Design a protein around this ligand. Sequence first.
Ligand SMILES: [Ca+2]
Ligand SMILES: [Ca+2]
Ligand SMILES: [Ca+2]
Ligand SMILES: [Ca+2]
Length: 148
Amino acid sequence: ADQLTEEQIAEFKEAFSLFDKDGDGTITTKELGTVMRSLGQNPTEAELQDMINEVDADGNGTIDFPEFLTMMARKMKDTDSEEEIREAFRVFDKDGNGYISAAELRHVMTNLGEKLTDEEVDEMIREADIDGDGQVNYEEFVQMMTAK
Ligand SMILES: [Ca+2]
Ligand SMILES: [Ca+2]
Ligand SMILES: [Ca+2]
Ligand SMILES: [Ca+2]
């Protein structure tokens, strides 16, 4: 589904409180980055406050529960395993040997649902593309899909 079930909201409520250091109803930068460090990442507060601000409904820069449900919905629907990402990466890569070229990426993301033109594909790539090679790799892909 796109919308959450009473079981998932329940648990996104149990997670919400668990994360909260003060015990209020707002998550800060500091609170969530501590979980993000334990789940294996390492953003800074700054890199946190960025993605906080985008997803803020009210605007305030602290995370309320309907914006955690909006966050974690958008997470939990998309990501399965991480293994799902990998196999879907090497579904997208036509030959399969490494990289999804601009060409390959256009065609399969156009078959998926939004129609992309050349420059729409280039632009998706370019912001994430470290080599400047015009291809999207697995770490660039995982970075790219995270962003827009
Ligand atoms: Ca708090
Ligand atoms: Ca807010
Ligand atoms: Ca390829
Ligand atoms: Ca690249």
